[PDB]
Design an enzyme around this catalytic site. Structure first.
Site, short mmCIF file in Angstrom:
data_model
loop_
_atom_site.label_atom_id
_atom_site.label_comp_id
_atom_site.label_asym_id
_atom_site.label_seq_id
_atom_site.Cartn_x
_atom_site.Cartn_y
_atom_site.Cartn_z
N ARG C 37 -90.87 16.24 -22.79
CA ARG C 37 -90.64 15.64 -24.10
C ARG C 37 -91.79 16.09 -24.97
NH1 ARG C 37 -90.20 10.35 -26.69
NH2 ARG C 37 -90.29 11.92 -28.39
N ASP C 70 -94.18 7.22 -20.89
CA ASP C 70 -94.91 8.15 -21.74
C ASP C 70 -96.10 8.83 -21.07
OD1 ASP C 70 -93.70 8.29 -24.38
OD2 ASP C 70 -94.22 6.16 -24.59
N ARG C 71 -96.82 8.11 -20.21
CA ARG C 71 -98.12 8.59 -19.74
C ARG C 71 -98.27 8.43 -18.23
NH1 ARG C 71 -98.42 5.44 -23.94
NH2 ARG C 71 -99.15 3.67 -22.68
N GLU C 196 -100.54 8.92 -36.92
CA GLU C 196 -100.22 9.44 -35.60
C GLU C 196 -99.46 10.75 -35.74
OE1 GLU C 196 -99.80 5.52 -32.76
OE2 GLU C 196 -97.96 6.27 -33.72
N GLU C 197 -99.59 11.60 -34.72
CA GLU C 197 -98.67 12.73 -34.54
C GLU C 197 -98.48 13.61 -35.77
OE1 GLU C 197 -95.27 10.57 -33.00
OE2 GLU C 197 -96.04 10.70 -30.94
N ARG C 212 -97.17 10.19 -38.96
CA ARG C 212 -96.39 9.00 -38.65
C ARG C 212 -97.27 7.76 -38.79
NH1 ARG C 212 -93.83 8.19 -32.54
NH2 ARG C 212 -93.68 5.90 -32.48
N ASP C 213 -96.85 6.83 -39.65
CA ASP C 213 -97.49 5.52 -39.75
C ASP C 213 -96.64 4.60 -38.88
OD1 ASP C 213 -98.27 3.26 -42.57
OD2 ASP C 213 -98.10 2.84 -40.42
N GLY C 217 -95.73 1.67 -42.66
CA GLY C 217 -94.92 2.47 -43.55
C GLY C 217 -93.71 3.17 -42.98
N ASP C 244 -89.56 8.43 -42.33
CA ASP C 244 -89.83 7.90 -40.99
C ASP C 244 -88.54 7.33 -40.39
OD1 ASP C 244 -91.34 7.43 -38.75
OD2 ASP C 244 -92.64 5.90 -39.62
N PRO C 267 -90.66 1.53 -34.89
CA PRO C 267 -91.77 1.59 -35.86
C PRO C 267 -92.10 3.00 -36.35
CG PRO C 267 -92.65 1.38 -33.65
CD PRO C 267 -91.14 1.27 -33.52
N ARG C 291 -82.96 7.61 -33.75
CA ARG C 291 -83.21 9.04 -33.69
C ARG C 291 -81.91 9.81 -33.47
NH1 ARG C 291 -88.84 8.63 -30.02
NH2 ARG C 291 -90.01 7.47 -31.63
N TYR C 325 -88.28 13.91 -32.07
CA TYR C 325 -89.44 14.43 -32.80
C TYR C 325 -89.09 15.70 -33.57
CZ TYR C 325 -92.93 11.28 -30.83
OH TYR C 325 -93.69 10.17 -30.52
C1 LIG Z 1 -97.16 5.14 -27.27
O1 LIG Z 1 -96.32 5.53 -28.23
C2 LIG Z 1 -96.71 6.45 -29.08
C3 LIG Z 1 -95.99 7.72 -28.83
O2 LIG Z 1 -94.68 7.62 -29.23
C4 LIG Z 1 -93.66 8.07 -28.47
C5 LIG Z 1 -92.34 7.93 -29.11
O3 LIG Z 1 -91.29 8.46 -28.54
O4 LIG Z 1 -92.24 7.33 -30.10
C6 LIG Z 1 -93.90 9.35 -27.71
C7 LIG Z 1 -95.29 9.56 -27.14
N1 LIG Z 1 -95.39 10.05 -25.81
C8 LIG Z 1 -96.34 10.97 -25.43
N2 LIG Z 1 -97.09 11.64 -26.23
N3 LIG Z 1 -96.40 11.16 -24.19
C9 LIG Z 1 -96.34 8.50 -27.53
N4 LIG Z 1 -97.71 8.81 -27.31
C10 LIG Z 1 -98.43 8.57 -26.16
C11 LIG Z 1 -99.82 9.08 -26.16
O5 LIG Z 1 -98.00 7.87 -25.35
C12 LIG Z 1 -96.59 5.99 -30.53
O6 LIG Z 1 -96.97 6.94 -31.35
C13 LIG Z 1 -97.42 4.73 -30.70
O7 LIG Z 1 -98.76 4.88 -30.64
CA LIG Z 2 -93.28 3.69 -39.56
#
Ligand SMILES: CO[C@@H]([C@@H]1OC(C(=O)O)=C[C@H](NC(=N)N)[C@H]1NC(C)=O)[C@H](O)CO
Ligand SMILES: [Ca+2]
Ligand SMILES: *[C@@H]1O[C@H](CO)[C@@H](O[C@@H]2O[C@H](CO)[C@@H](O[C@@H]3O[C@H](CO[C@H]4O[C@H](CO[C@H]5O[C@H](CO)[C@@H](O)[C@H](O)[C@@H]5O)[C@@H](O)[C@H](O[C@H]5O[C@H](CO)[C@@H](O)[C@H](O)[C@@H]5O)[C@@H]4O)[C@@H](O)[C@H](O)[C@@H]3O)[C@H](O)[C@H]2NC(C)=O)[C@H](O)[C@H]1NC(C)=O
Ligand SMILES: *[C@@H]1O[C@H](CO)[C@@H](O[C@@H]2O[C@H](CO)[C@@H](O[C@@H]3O[C@H](CO[C@H]4O[C@H](CO[C@H]5O[C@H](CO)[C@@H](O)[C@H](O)[C@@H]5O)[C@@H](O)[C@H](O[C@H]5O[C@H](CO)[C@@H](O)[C@H](O)[C@@H]5O)[C@@H]4O)[C@@H](O)[C@H](O)[C@@H]3O)[C@H](O)[C@H]2NC(C)=O)[C@H](O)[C@H]1NC(C)=O
Ligand SMILES: *[C@@H]1O[C@H](CO)[C@@H](O[C@@H]2O[C@H](CO)[C@@H](O[C@@H]3O[C@H](CO[C@H]4O[C@H](CO[C@H]5O[C@H](CO)[C@@H](O)[C@H](O)[C@@H]5O)[C@@H](O)[C@H](O[C@H]5O[C@H](CO)[C@@H](O)[C@H](O)[C@@H]5O)[C@@H]4O)[C@@H](O)[C@H](O)[C@@H]3O)[C@H](O)[C@H]2NC(C)=O)[C@H](O)[C@H]1NC(C)=O
Ligand SMILES: *[C@@H]1O[C@H](CO)[C@@H](O[C@@H]2O[C@H](CO)[C@@H](O[C@@H]3O[C@H](CO[C@H]4O[C@H](CO[C@H]5O[C@H](CO)[C@@H](O)[C@H](O)[C@@H]5O)[C@@H](O)[C@H](O[C@H]5O[C@H](CO)[C@@H](O)[C@H](O)[C@@H]5O)[C@@H]4O)[C@@H](O)[C@H](O)[C@@H]3O)[C@H](O)[C@H]2NC(C)=O)[C@H](O)[C@H]1NC(C)=O
Ligand SMILES: *[C@@H]1O[C@H](CO)[C@@H](O[C@@H]2O[C@H](CO)[C@@H](O[C@@H]3O[C@H](CO)[C@@H](O)[C@H](O)[C@@H]3O)[C@H](O)[C@H]2NC(C)=O)[C@H](O)[C@H]1NC(C)=O
Ligand SMILES: *[C@@H]1O[C@H](CO)[C@@H](O[C@@H]2O[C@H](CO)[C@@H](O[C@@H]3O[C@H](CO)[C@@H](O)[C@H](O)[C@@H]3O)[C@H](O)[C@H]2NC(C)=O)[C@H](O)[C@H]1NC(C)=O
Ligand SMILES: CO[C@@H]([C@@H]1OC(C(=O)O)=C[C@H](NC(=N)N)[C@H]1NC(C)=O)[C@H](O)CO
Ligand SMILES: CO[C@@H]([C@@H]1OC(C(=O)O)=C[C@H](NC(=N)N)[C@H]1NC(C)=O)[C@H](O)CO
Ligand SMILES: CO[C@@H]([C@@H]1OC(C(=O)O)=C[C@H](NC(=N)N)[C@H]1NC(C)=O)[C@H](O)CO
Ligand SMILES: [Ca+2]
Ligand SMILES: [Ca+2]
Ligand SMILES: [Ca+2]
Lengths: 389, 389, 389, 389
Positions: C37, C70-71, C196-197, C212-213, C217, C244, C267, C291, C325
């Site tokens: 992903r 995610d991690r 973010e991101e 990304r807020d 936002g 967003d 969010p 999405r 994304y």
């Molecule tokens: C934890 O969620 C965050 C990230 O968001 C998500 C998503 O599908 O929305 C994918 C990421 N997955 C990966 N990058 N692996 C996340 N980011 C991380 C570091 O978990 C979000 O931005 C909140 O801080």
């Molecule tokens: Ca938002």
């Protein structure tokens, strides 16, 4: 690159060390591995590669059914990195067909494949990865060649080819190539009555080929080639130690000029020998009947002495395991003062001996000479046929 | 290329950062991944690669059954791009056998594999992808070597090899190679009673090897080599912090000159340490009994102080997870003013601890030093054994 | 190579042409394809490559179960040849971790991955295929970064990183790297409340990041960076066209300085925009809730005009299909007088929306600008989820 | 590299020798092989490669269901090493779409793919691995092109493209590219009533294209191009030997200026011919109704003589086996004094003729000219459809 010249003598050999083993059948039980047979190795200035005739299907694939069959439009000469098993993902297709030879002249690789129907086969000669010469069948009966590497000297690469019966006199020729182009064609001379599947190596300006007489002899024909004059002689390996399969028990005296008949039930197998006076080694299957086991026998003056016998030996594959074709190659570009003998053994699995499966394929083991006295063990294929059933 | 000279000091290390992880067992549950064990990493001017001893079968293949077995004709030293999992499609076969070492001298890579029967094994030494030297067994009892990288200095690459009993005094030698050719052979001196599977690294003209005493000690032998004079000394790691497995509880005082006995039931495991005065780090399994967990302990003066203990630590693999062999390597060609310590942990899955499956294999995790204080988590294998059943 | 300088203007864009599509889920239904992903693309002087975060398992593998997570210690940044699907056989492992960015400075590639536990994560910065810098978490709460390419100018590559809550104010920094070494660190300034991101691109010495807020936002933060002075400003995309997900219906007036709240239930999602006065394009999901779908909207002066709306559009993925994304990249080394905008869309399949399967993965589609008015169709993933059940 | 100039004459051809065969369906029964159709070969100074339109799924994959369908967002032009079968692991994605052409100009490769909906398709022109030009549909009805290689001369590469009905008059253009950039556009002139899927080759400054009239003719249109003046003429192949499929029995007299109608039930198939006075060869399916069998017929003056008939022939695929598309290519960089004609035959398996399976795919066979009289056999696909059921 520059043309390879056969300037060096053959290395002295006391025993054989392991060079490579692909474990293709073990791996192919669960990976995508091509069905092959008639493998060999051939080197170039960069290193050595494995070669074989693919059957155009994977081992576990349903199309592996029937792969005992020798000749089809689905076969090709493939080459791949030494030690890997051959997969549809990692092979280079050298040419298309069901009988081949290949060698590097120091500048580029020549590869030759025969294909076509039994009565109308043809060779396509490739050089530097492109087709350069085509040769039609001259006798209308399965035009075929070495199934191991050719040897080059000053750009001249002789290749032994045969067209005609497997069980009667045939028409054998030596064709001298340069850059894949015919320089000269000789009809076979000498006392060898039938010649197939020559295994060749070179040293000090001489190329020697050890072949298969499928018609009469259980002793192996030997062709001696001068690649400069482009001339040759042929006869049989003199030693009483017979090295074809099938063969009778070794007699008290060998024969240099005529086939020693007998043995049952196979008329022949591809094999090899390194013939260098006292530094002479003969390979053969351990069974005199079947393609099982493989032994290297040091037989001083095997080439010239009808009474020569073994003074040492090394079992390569034990007699409880299947072997197959064997042949010669040399890394002519090694960082050594002599050309060191190497050989491979084809480890055939499946039909006809294991007829419980529908396929025939092989793996490869390859060894090279050492002046050391090295311990040995059996380098059998190592697959369990039951896992394929 | 030019020969690597060990001119630089060892980097200071405060914690360990993740370098690579192949997740081989997770991936191999459904991809074509080779069964391996005894892995390591080794670098060259171009980058770092993963190495291991293949078992000549894929993990999901039926031939994975029985792969707890240490030595067979189907094993080979393979190398592949760091981070990838080893497949029959992506590996380079370095040599054939069941014990290995490899290192790059700045110009070419030397690789060594032992193969053969227990009483008649032999090493084949490869240099630049070609075999150059062969060495027969000197004691007729499983000639074997480091199972991680050797180290080179001014073209000289020492290798520690052992031949003889696993459970009694054996015959260990240091062989100094240059371009795969023997320059000198030393019999092991020093107070280490038994030496196996040395993990070596170099800095400022010194090569240090941290090894496995399989006979007596739960403390690890340390060999210190001068690759210029081609001489060495050996003894035990002095620290009371014992780092073999199995081992007893750490005593109040270690021992520099003699083995500290005890622990049950395993006689040893390959491991490593970086020994640089106050900048000293010891790796060991977390369990004192079994190959589970892995921790890095900073033990100032571990090499010289029998009372030295940890001042910091980092868990690499938690104790609820299996570990295995561990060893040292360094990217000697990094763009840095010091040589930075790196290590790998072999994450063994399957037999004998998970005897619910028929196979034994591993994945790899590798880490390198950092002067930062970095957070840590467990880098366990991550496969679910139930998925394989 | 020489350092990339952002000397060229952004190409004018009238529509978007197809660049690449890997069809990874379709292929992975029956081939060995890694679960991924957070993909993106990044170019270098030789060409462009695909990048993503692997989950350390194949799609059909049993370990794909749970990959919504995610991690984990089993994730890594992988890259592969553009257009191919990611397999364990064809990927390059750039670094190990679960959040990444990568960019080529004209000479070598910098890659950054965060790994570790939520409260103690760390970044490892790689340059030229070797680790060069490590950065510990500064706020102890999931140190993380762009999940698409960074941009370099005269050797300076700024990277936006965030550490802290996903649902409250966090600590964002811009770190300016050169050869993977920190040149300067800035705390985020400006009116963006949460970052973010970031998706970044550059032209005429300016780097713009669209982010990304996740806190407040539904409008996207925009960071404007001067890589020479190493300074920046930030605010929100002014346009009433909110981009967003989730988001409310677009209001009559946007907001440059403050978050426009509302929308349900997500969010945020990573996204992008190209902001160049009249030549401005916004991407967003078609659904304001989820999405699904993807549309490109040409919104002149989107960056500065709160009342700006679309004058043209192109559906990239229809609203009956899942997206995910999206991010920016540019082939800065193309043979063109302007830098042409490109973007990718991550096509997420599986959990949580398709919870009938146990896994989460994606495929990739990527497009680039054209001055032509090109017809369009939907470039959806194209896999049938039923085939996986 | 330097631009290819068509300075050489066409080689004389007496028979056809085997060049390559990938056995893709046989292998793909059990390996990961992509579903394809519309294959071809194209060479460059380094060698020749295979090309085809992928369907974005493997052959054994569930997504192979429905692959009779011609146009989808999941298709791409892929290329791979000649002789290998196309897998997701070994292919290069040239561009994305469902109609293509490609050729190397001596310096770099130009590749063109059309994609999009029937009423709004577009071509993306790639050069040197990067997109350089985009072309929208001019008639809103399936903009499409050659499905085999284009030909370049002094950097100029003409490409024939058609937009409009398959069953009525359409809008065909010749676009002359240089480095992927449009130099000139011509509307098709001449007497050919409908033009699709041109197969082109060049010699002595002339480019000849042999095409498919899908509207009326069972005789094939021939376009003759001067790449220097960038002008052309077109008409029909004069020979009474009709070479489209379907077609009626050959009449007593052919027609140069008008379509010969008749045949049932297919309106056309892509094919080719080499037209060089007495040295002229026509390919066609053996069946006049269906895509089965393939024969090469030497028809002197086929291009100009309405009464010309065959003086020799060679069966390439016997009439008990399926064929498909066929096309021309030449290794313009061969080490020869003439340009030697080569061709491929697409061996289609599956739907609609084998409707017992759910998929449609193909394998490839390719042959080149020889001045020798070489024996021939059938080079059929060789897969057993029952194995797929
Ligand atoms: C934890 O969620 C965050 C990230 O968001 C998500 C998503 O599908 O929305 C994918 C990421 N997955 C990966 N990058 N692996 C996340 N980011 C991380 C570091 O978990 C979000 O931005 C909140 O801080
Ligand atoms: Ca938002
Ligand atoms: C550690 O490794 C060392 C290096 O590998 C190894 O050294 C080996 O040591 C052995 C034992 O000393 C030596 O064996 C010697 O071999 C010669 C030659 O034997 C071969 O030829 C004879 C003669 O064959 C002909 O005559 C008979 C009838 O008499 C016919 O049957 C035959 O067809 C021929 O016409 C043959 O009898 C031998 O047969 C043995 O080997 C074959 C396999 O080749 C077996 O099938 C058979 O059952 C039998 O075991 C053989 O073919 C012999 O003359 C000597 O008497 C002696 O036997 C090796 O040469 C030597 N190898 C090398 C490379 O140095 C060490 O032994 C090893 N250490 C340990 C502990 O294993
Ligand atoms: C974010 O990341 C930071 C960087 O990674 C991290 O920093 C770490 O912080 C901790 C806590 O402050 C520090 O821990 C310190 O470690 C030293 C050394 O401890 C080690 O050695 C002792 C002594 O072992 C010997 O003696 C005992 C008998 O007393 C015997 O059992 C043993 O066999 C030896 O003979 C040992 O007791 C410790 O045991 C701990 O760790 C092991 C794993 O190694 C566990 O199995 C065990 O249950 C126990 O938890 C350890 O082995 C110690 O002396 C100090 O008192 C202190 O504990 C780390 O050094 C430090 N690491 C680094 C690299 O800086 C942060 O903690 C982290 N933040 C968060 C919130 O997680
Ligand atoms: C061959 O290919 C050509 C090139 O691709 C193609 O050309 C396209 O032609 C169409 C038709 O002429 C043009 O459409 C035009 O688009 C603009 C902009 O529309 C977008 O924005 C409006 C406004 O959105 C905002 O306001 C509304 C409330 O009013 C809110 O809902 C919204 O959230 C915003 O706040 C929007 O209404 C449009 O919605 C359409 O598209 C979306 C997908 O984006 C759909 O979900 C939706 O149902 C609806 O269909 C759109 O988002 C508009 O103002 C014009 O009136 C006109 O519609 C394209 O711009 C043009 N594209 C290009 C690249 O040139 C040809 O049409 C094609 N030929 C054929 C036969 O197919
Ligand atoms: C070893 O290999 C050698 C080299 O490959 C091979 O040499 C071949 O030898 C044969 C036999 O001497 C030669 O055949 C000759 O071919 C010509 C041309 O025949 C073709 O055209 C005719 C005319 O077709 C038109 O007219 C008829 C009505 O009369 C219509 O049906 C048709 O549609 C056309 O309008 C045609 O009749 C031929 O048909 C044969 O072949 C087709 C396949 O193409 C079959 O489907 C059909 O059933 C029939 O068998 C053919 O299409 C002919 O005029 C001569 O009379 C003679 O037949 C080859 O040319 C020659 N090839 C080469 C490359 O040199 C050796 O034969 C081989 N040795 C062995 C033992 O196998
Ligand atoms: C995994 O490998 C093991 C070890 O090879 C396999 O177990 C073995 O299976 C064979 C065949 O059933 C057994 O052979 C039999 O032995 C008896 C007694 O010696 C003999 O009388 C029979 O005629 C036959 O030869 C063998 O004993 C057995 N070994 C052990 C230790 O159990 C096992 O089947 C393999 N498993 C899989 C799933 O492949
Ligand atoms: C291969 O692909 C074909 C085509 O997609 C598959 O056939 C289709 O299967 C679906 C699901 O069963 C059928 O959908 C149903 O259609 C009816 C009538 O329209 C509707 O009332 C149902 O609610 C459902 O939507 C569809 O009709 C059918 N199409 C055809 C032409 O048969 C087929 O299942 C696939 N085969 C395999 C082995 O994957
Ligand atoms: C036909 O048998 C010949 C070849 O022999 C066999 C064998 O296993 O013995 C393998 C070959 N298979 C392939 N090379 N494919 C044959 N040779 C050929 C050309 O069939 C034999 O030498 C008699 O002439
Ligand atoms: C035999 O056991 C030795 C080796 O130990 C084991 C192990 O997991 O502990 C792995 C090796 N496996 C391989 N290298 N293949 C062995 N070493 C060998 C040569 O068997 C031990 O060091 C005693 O001498
Ligand atoms: C639509 O049919 C056309 C094409 O024909 C067919 C065929 O097997 O006959 C294959 C192509 N498939 C692909 N190239 N994918 C088509 N061409 C296209 C663009 O669909 C025909 O030439 C009529 O215009
Ligand atoms: Ca015989
Ligand atoms: Ca011990
Ligand atoms: Ca027609």
């Amino acid at each position: 690159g520059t043309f390879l010249n056969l300037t060096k003598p053959l290395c002295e050999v006391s025993s054989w060390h392991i060079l490579s083993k692909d474990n293709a059948i073990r791996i192919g039980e669960d990976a995508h591995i091509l069905v092959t047979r008639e493998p060999y190795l051939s080197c170039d200035p960069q290193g050595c590669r494995m070669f074989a005739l693919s059957q155009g299907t994977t081992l576990r694939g349903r199309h592996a059914n029937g792969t005992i069959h020798d000749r089809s439009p689905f076969r090709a000469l493939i080459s791949w990195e030494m030690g890997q098993a051959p997969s549809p993902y990692n092979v280079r297709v050298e040419c298309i067909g069901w009988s081949s030879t290949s060698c590097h002249d120091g500048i580029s690789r020549m590869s030759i494949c025969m294909s076509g129907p039994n009565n109308n086969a043809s060779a396509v000669v490739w050089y530097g990865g492109r087709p350069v010469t085509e040769i039609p069948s001259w006798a209308g009966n399965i035009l075929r060649t070495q199934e191991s590497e050719c040897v080059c000297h000053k750009g001249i690469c002789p290749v032994v080819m045969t067209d005609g019966p497997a069980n009667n006199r045939a028409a054998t020729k030596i064709i001298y190539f340069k850059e894949g182009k015919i320089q000269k064609i000789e009809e076979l001379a000498g006392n060898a009555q039938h010649i197939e599947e020559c295994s060749c190596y070179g040293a000090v300006g001489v190329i020697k080929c050890v072949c298969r007489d499928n018609w009469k002899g259980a002793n192996r024909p030997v062709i001696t080639i001068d690649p400069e004059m482009m001339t040759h002689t042929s006869k049989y390996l003199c030693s009483k130690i017979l090295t074809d399969t099938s063969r009778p028990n070794d007699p008290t005296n060998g024969n240099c000029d005529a086939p020693i008949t007998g043995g049952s039930p196979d008329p022949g197998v591809k094999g090899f020998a390194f013939l260098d006076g006292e530094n002479s080694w003969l390979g053969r299957t351990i069974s005199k009947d079947s393609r099982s086991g493989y032994e290297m026998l040091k037989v001083p003056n095997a080439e010239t002495d009808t009474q020569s016998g073994p003074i040492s030996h090394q079992v390569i594959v034990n007699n409880q395991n299947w072997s197959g074709y064997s042949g010669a190659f040399i890394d002519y570009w090694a960082n050594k003062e002599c050309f060191n003998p190497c050989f491979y053994v084809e480890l055939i699995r499946g039909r006809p001996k294991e007829s419980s499966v529908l396929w025939t394929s092989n793996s490869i083991v390859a060894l090279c000479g050492s002046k050391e006295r090295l311990g040995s063990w059996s380098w059998h294929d190592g697959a369990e046929i039951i896992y394929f059933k």
